[PDB]
Design a protein around this ligand. Structure first.
Ligand SMILES: CC[C@]1(O)C[C@@H]2CN(CCc3c([nH]c4cc(OC)ccc34)[C@@](C(=O)OC)(c3cc4c(cc3OC)N(C)[C@H]3[C@@](O)(C(=O)OC)[C@H](OC(C)=O)[C@]5(CC)C=CCN6CC[C@]43[C@@H]65)C2)C1
Ligand SMILES: Nc1nc2c(ncn2[C@@H]2O[C@H](COP(=O)(O)OP(=O)(O)OP(=O)(O)O)[C@@H](O)[C@H]2O)c(=O)[nH]1
Ligand SMILES: Nc1nc2c(ncn2[C@@H]2O[C@H](COP(=O)(O)OP(=O)(O)O)[C@@H](O)[C@H]2O)c(=O)[nH]1
Ligand SMILES: [Ca+2]
Ligand SMILES: [Mg+2]
Lengths: 54, 439, 331, 428
């Protein structure tokens, strides 16, 4: 119904047409969480090595 | 003029990036060695294409791109391919051993060992930028790198660049081309961890691309280069406003305001017409009416789903070729009576329209016929949550038996991160349904 | 050889459909959560429509039309008919109806039309003085609907008894609209009563709230042979000319109206659905639409034939194995 | 470079390993001397997964040869590709293990294992990116069985982050008449259930029944058996040896095949089944390959697939053929028998296609199944085991090497555990 904001270029054009109207963590918390599992994992491994040592 | 840095993560992001930069070079007339015969801004300039390429004093135009895979096989192809002289060694980053389709191995294990190197190489580009506005990030949901490194990068990006926009082009997993049974697990994880860090995400379901290739390119068994040449058209369409003179979607912040009133619901649906086999013995060319109408057929979307059952929040039409507005509003006037296009109470039923007179560029020897006019629709419809319910279901069946979970835990990740990711996704499906509630 | 899943276990009609399919020796039935099916007889609620049509190597078909509820929920229908110019106020086969919220609503608009003989309806409740009815919908908390209560119902003799008509309509994937040649009359057992609409059973002709207060016809179910023969003898017409013509026009109009919103012509899965249409016939032999039910049961006599017509029209068309009981309503 | 370290141990382990190097060497264009002859370059693109290169573009199998007795090794050295293995990699003793697990694991084998690890180390020394280890051995003798699993335990302690993979020949009365094999196999399975990532259950009962019933071999030799074994080993390694997308290295394969850590024992299949020499004339159609690939008459483990449910499945097609037809035939397998694939692991069948076919075939298919029906193989060994164990018979052969009945009771319990854990997920 209502074309609006028409703009034209050599390249093309652009506009808007309305048919009807309406009605965060930090570098440290990251390094903490990364190293929290580099540990949980290093422990799961040393536990394996220990069982193998028996 | 404000620069945009492209980041391509994993196999899917790297090969897809290559397809885009190939197209970008054809579209901007930039040879396989970075020489742009029609630039007179020799050694610089603040032109519209300068948002995506910087320039060498020697006349070389070089993508503002960073590719990064935890294994070298793919990116090696890039450092020996037809566009080698284009990129410079310091932007092609490979590890040696990959994520084994394991979100945890890419986020927690092999990620830690490389996040810094990459953030280095990314700020190296941020410093050849006069007013960098943000990042376009290309990655799969299903690989270990594409899901797990990508979500790690995103969080550090929202730390080293708190005021910059981040858009994603995300490949959603489809069994016809997938290589891992655990892709659903990786899809959910990286979405949950990337959600609050992405401003707007364009999801392409390999299922959808794969069928457009069989149905409309009559290709028996689409390959990645088939899929990726088509994905590059759609990506080029979405980014043409950043690379050319115009007044619609002129910077990454505008995609947010145009497509995303609700920040969590930042997954606008792409639809592309027409896709025509370059083998077809001449095609009767399609009108502004016909291609505009083809935007409301599910068989043309990057995600199969039914926008009839769902409400709209924003709609953008992006035209390339022989199009003038009078045709556009006549076409829109018609489809509106023939089709189920319901917006939300708090948004005006309307379309933002962008026309670039240059018709779409085809890759010599690709599968796509050249055409006089083409259009990409960007519509934020709640119907796209059908793809969330599909993925969440597959996740529920496997997780209720902890199937394969031991692979992630094995890498340091806590079983509970699984359930946290899944509850966040359960909130998302809730948001979406709130907005489409009438009928 | 095809596969199907049953996810609505209280469906008389699709119980017989599954039974019929198994007994063909060409339809395996799988566990209700096995994805690799052809046919889904689906739940009546929250059916996972978004999960159909993504099984490579499988043509999938489901027994409901997503969105068809807009025709099958009392207050939805009211809204569908008013706002669809396809139907609208040039509409003459629907009683005046108003959606009302138990305190985008038209409880305001209702009172002004009441001002004129006036009788209206909601276990619900029919009355004639307004001030009290609204108090009822405010008892329960769910938005129901109030329509003109037909003060001049056509009345069967002998018995002087009110009835309604039920037609079963089957919409297939190609949106063919099929009307089952056999319909049924749900016949009030005791006589209609003019002034004083406060006893039910003889006003509300629903099977349940009647098989509980009864003579004339077995099960209070009159079929078309008898009702047509009654029509010839008492009124001197036939069923087709006097009633059916109106019905078929009302079915075709309703389903054509929502077709663009629910068709699966170009969709990654296909749909068919069985609808039950309920009409009342009035004194001047005019036909009115009461409700459409999206999950209808069938009349006991007519199950074998209808449930095998579903198999043949809706299911074997899309999955072919190794006189017609419907009338195709043409559009 | 994603290298793999191959180890073969004992008589069986060394025989079937020799045959595997024979085959994959032909497939890759390497000759009885270690020099490439490829009418193709697909051959050399991933050659370094199983070979190191020398000056003169010489390739040498990254294989280690291990036994407690010098035969076999001599027949391997005086065999087809004998001269092509690195000589300082034959690592052998003299006494042998006499089909006795304890001798291999605890006494004879202890004496020899350190020197095996040194050759491993030196090979591990020089990999850009070590994937892990593949071991060939039988489970019914002493060396491959007892000393093979000791090796596995020592390697995992040195390389806890590499992938452990075995080809484990299971024992069968139809093929062998040594009476203590159920003992040696229950002791090995116990080890394998704890210390490997993937194990191919190459069952001598299947190999026998296939050769006798199907190939119509009335007097099967171990060559007939090992003809089936190298075919299958050639098949299941296809995706590691040529370029590709699916299961292209061990860890990706394990992430695809192993949903629970203990349930990592796989049923290989192969199609078409062939006798050696017996030349081929009409290739299979793609639908033929598929039906045979899943046919129980083609499995290398004597288990009934229709008695269980597939947890996961990898399928590998070789030779020039249409991926569309392959795609269609695999979907149809799944959608016509969906009951047999667990519903709670969506899309659990992954398919690869390689253009190079196996010597003397134009079309072939290799199946790798993780089926709960494998519990049948462990039940069979468990029954033979109890029938001797409840009378503690022949046990003195092991107690005399230092072992306690207790170790036997543990191995028995762990394998019965394994069987019931396979039943849990079949009834889920
Ligand atoms: C692939 C590797 C092998 O080559 C496979 C086998 C065994 N082996 C040595 C070769 C051999 C065979 N036979 C021999 C007789 C002989 O003379 C002194 C000397 C050598 C042999 C076999 C053959 O080629 O036989 C025609 C051979 C051998 C055996 C067999 C079938 C078979 O056929 C293919 N049974 C399944 C079992 C047997 O218990 C049974 O259940 O019968 C159905 C069988 O009892 C009966 C009633 O037969 C028998 C026969 C000697 C008796 C004693 C125990 N053991 C154990 C094997 C077995 C055997 C080939 C290794
Ligand atoms: N459209 C398209 N999708 C791809 C392509 N490459 C990979 N994918 C998708 O990515 C999924 C596999 O995960 P990837 O992102 O490739 O994993 P990766 O990038 O190789 O990194 P890792 O696997 O973790 O080592 C597949 O299921 C595909 O759907 C591609 O070239 N084009
Ligand atoms: N398939 C196959 N099985 C074999 C071969 N050699 C031995 N076996 C099996 O291995 C078992 C004997 O193991 P053995 O060789 O004594 O083990 P080792 O002493 O450690 O070398 C027998 O039951 C055979 O079935 C072979 O070449 N091929
Ligand atoms: Ca410039
Ligand atoms: Mg990768």
């Amino acid at each position: 119904m209502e074309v609006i904001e028409l703009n034209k270029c050599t390249s093309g054009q652009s506009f808007e047409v309305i048919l009807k109207p309406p009605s965060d963590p930090s570098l440290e918390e990251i390094q903490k969480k990364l190293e929290a599992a580099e540990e949980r994992r290093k422990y799961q491994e040393a536990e394996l090595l220990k069982h193998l040592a028996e | 003029m404000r620069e945009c840095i492209s980041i391509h993560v994993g196999q899917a992001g790297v090969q897809i990036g290559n397809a885009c930069w190939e197209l970008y070079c054809l579209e901007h007339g930039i040879q396989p060695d970075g020489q742009m015969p029609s630039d007179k801004t020799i050694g610089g300039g603040d032109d519209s294409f300068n948002t995506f390429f910087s320039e060498t004093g020697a006349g070389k135009h070089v993508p503002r791109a960073v590719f990064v895979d935890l294994e070298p096989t793919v990116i090696d192809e890039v450092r020996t391919g037809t566009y080698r002289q284009l990129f410079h060694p310091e932007q092609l980053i490979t590890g040696k051993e990959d994520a084994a389709n394991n979100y945890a191995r890419g986020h927690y294990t092999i990620g830690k060992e490389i996040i810094d190197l990459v953030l280095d190489r990314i700020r190296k580009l941020a410093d050849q930028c006069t007013g960098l506005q943000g990042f376009l990030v290309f990655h799969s949901f299903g690989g270990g790198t594409g899901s797990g490194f990508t979500s790690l990068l995103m969080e550090r990006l929202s730390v080293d660049y708190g005021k910059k926009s981040k858009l994603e082009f995300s490949i959603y997993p489809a069994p016809q081309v997938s290589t891992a049974v655990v892709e659903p697990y990786n899809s959910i994880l990286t979405t949950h961890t990337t959600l609050e860090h992405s401003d707007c995400a364009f999801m392409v379901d390999n299922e959808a691309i794969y069928d457009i290739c069989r149905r409309n390119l009559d290709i028996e068994r689409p390959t990645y280069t088939n899929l990726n040449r088509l994905i590059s058209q759609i990506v080029s369409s979405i980014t043409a406003s950043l690379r050319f003179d115009g007044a619609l979607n002129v910077d990454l912040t505008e995609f947010q305001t145009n497509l995303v009133p609700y920040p969590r619901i930042h997954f606008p649906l792409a639809t592309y017409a027409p896709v025509i086999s370059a083998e077809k013995a001449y095609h009767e060319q399609l009108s502004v009416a016909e291609i505009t109408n083809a935007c409301f057929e599910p068989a043309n979307q990057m995600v199969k789903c039914d926008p009839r059952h769902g409400k709209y929040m924003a709609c953008c039409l992006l035209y390339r070729g022989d199009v003038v507005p009078k045709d556009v509003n006549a076409a829109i006037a018609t489809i509106k009576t023939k089709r189920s296009i319901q917006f939300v109470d708090w948004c005006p039923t309307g379309f933002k329209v962008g026309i670039n007179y240059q018709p779409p560029t085809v890759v010599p020897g690709g599968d796509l016929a050249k055409v006089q006019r083409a259009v990409c629709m960007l519509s934020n419809t709640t119907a796209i949550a059908e793809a969330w319910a599909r993925l969440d279901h597959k996740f529920d069946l496997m997780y209720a038996k902890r199937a394969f979970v031991h692979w992630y835990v094995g890498e340091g990740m806590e079983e509970g991160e699984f359930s946290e990711a899944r509850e966040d996704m359960a909130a998302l499906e809730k948001d979406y349904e709130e907005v489409g509630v009438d009928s | 050889m095809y596969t199907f899943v049953v996810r609505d276990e209280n469906s008389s009609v699709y119980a017989e459909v599954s039974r019929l399919l198994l007994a063909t020796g060409q339809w395996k039935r799988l566990r209700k959560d096995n994805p690799r099916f052809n046919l889904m007889l689906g739940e009546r609620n929250r059916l996972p429509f978004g999960r159909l049509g993504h099984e490579p190597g499988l043509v999938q078909l489901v027994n409901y039309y997503r969105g068809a509820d807009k025709l099958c929920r009392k207050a939805s229908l009211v809204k569908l008919i008013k706002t669809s110019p396809e139907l609208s106020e040039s509409c003459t086969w629907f009683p005046e109806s108003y959606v009302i919220y138990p305190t985008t609503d038209e409880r305001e608009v209702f009172l002004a039309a009441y001002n004129r003989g006036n009788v209206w309806i909601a276990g619900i409740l029919i009355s004639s003085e307004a001030s009290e009815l609204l108090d009822f919908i405010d008892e329960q908390g769910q938005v129901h609907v109030i329509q003109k209560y037909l003060e001049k119902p056509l009345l069967l003799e002998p018995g002087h008894r009110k009835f309604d008509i039920r037609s079963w309509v089957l919409v297939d994937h190609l949106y063919n609209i099929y009307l089952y040649r056999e319909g049924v009359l749900r016949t009030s057992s005791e006589p209609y009563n003019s002034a004083n609409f406060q006893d039910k059973t003889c006003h509300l002709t629903n099977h349940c709230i009647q098989k509980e207060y009864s003579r004339y016809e077995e099960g209070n179910e009159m079929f078309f042979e008898e009702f047509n023969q009654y029509l010839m003898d008492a009124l001197n017409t036939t069923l087709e000319n006097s009633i059916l013509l109106q019905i078929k026009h009302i079915i075709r109009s309703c389903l054509m109206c929502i077709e663009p919103a629910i068709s699966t012509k170009h969709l990654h899965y296909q749909s068919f659905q069985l609808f039950g249409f309920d009409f009342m016939v009035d004194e001047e032999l005019k036909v009115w639409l009461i409700e459409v039910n999206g999950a209808p049961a069938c009349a006991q006599k007519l199950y074998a034939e209808l449930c095998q017509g579903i198999v043949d029209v809706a299911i074997s068309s899309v999955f072919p194995l190794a006189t017609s009981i419907f009338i195709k309503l043409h559009h | 470079m994603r290298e793999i370290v191959h180890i073969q141990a004992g008589q069986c382990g060394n025989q079937i390993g020799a045959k595997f190097w024979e085959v994959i060497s032909d497939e890759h264009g390497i000759d009885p001397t270690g020099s490439y002859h490829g009418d193709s370059d697909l051959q050399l693109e991933r050659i370094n997964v199983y070979y190191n290169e020398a000056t003169g573009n010489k390739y040498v199998p990254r294989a280690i040869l291990v036994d407690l007795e010098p035969g076999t090794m001599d027949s391997v050295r005086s065999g087809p590709f004998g001269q092509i293995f690195r000589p300082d990699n034959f690592v052998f003793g003299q006494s042998g293990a006499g089909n006795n697990w304890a001798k291999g694991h605890y006494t004879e084998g202890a004496e020899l294992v350190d020197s095996v690890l040194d050759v491993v180390r030196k090979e591990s020394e020089s990999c850009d990116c070590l994937q892990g280890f593949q071991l060939t051995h039988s489970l019914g003798g002493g060396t491959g069985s007892g000393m093979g699993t000791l090796l596995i335990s020592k390697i995992r302690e040195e390389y806890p982050d590499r992938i452990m993979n075995t080809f484990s020949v299971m024992p069968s009365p139809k093929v062998s008449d040594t009476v203590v094999e159920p003992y040696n196999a229950t002791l090995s399975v116990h080890q394998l259930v704890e210390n490997t990532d993937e194990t191919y259950c190459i069952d001598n009962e299947a190999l026998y029944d296939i050769c006798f019933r199907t190939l119509k071999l009335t007097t099967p030799t171990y060559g007939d058996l090992n003809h089936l074994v190298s075919a299958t080993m050639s098949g299941v390694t296809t995706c590691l040896r040529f370029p590709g997308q699916l299961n292209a290295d061990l860890r990706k394969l394990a992430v695809n095949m192993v949903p629970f850590p203990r349930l990592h024992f796989f049923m290989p299949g192969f199609a078409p089944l062939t006798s050696r020499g017996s030349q081929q004339y009409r290739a299979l159609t793609v639908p033929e390959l598929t039906q045979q690939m899943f046919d129980s008459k083609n499995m290398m483990a004597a288990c009934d697939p229709r008695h269980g449910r597939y947890l996961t499945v990898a399928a590998i097609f070789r030779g020039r053929m249409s991926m569309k037809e392959v795609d269609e035939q695999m979907l149809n397998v799944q959608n016509k028998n969906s009951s047999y694939f667990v519903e709670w692991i969506p899309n659990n069948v992954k398919t690869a296609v390689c253009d190079i076919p196996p010597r003397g075939l134009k079309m072939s298919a290799t199946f790798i199944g993780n089926s709960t029906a494998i519990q049948e193989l462990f039940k069979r060994i468990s029954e033979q085991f109890t029938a001797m164990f409840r009378r503690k018979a022949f046990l003195h052969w092991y107690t005399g090497e230092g072992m306690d009945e207790m170790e036997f009771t543990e191995a028995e319990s762990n394998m019965n555990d394994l069987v019931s854990e396979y039943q849990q997920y079949q009834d889920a």
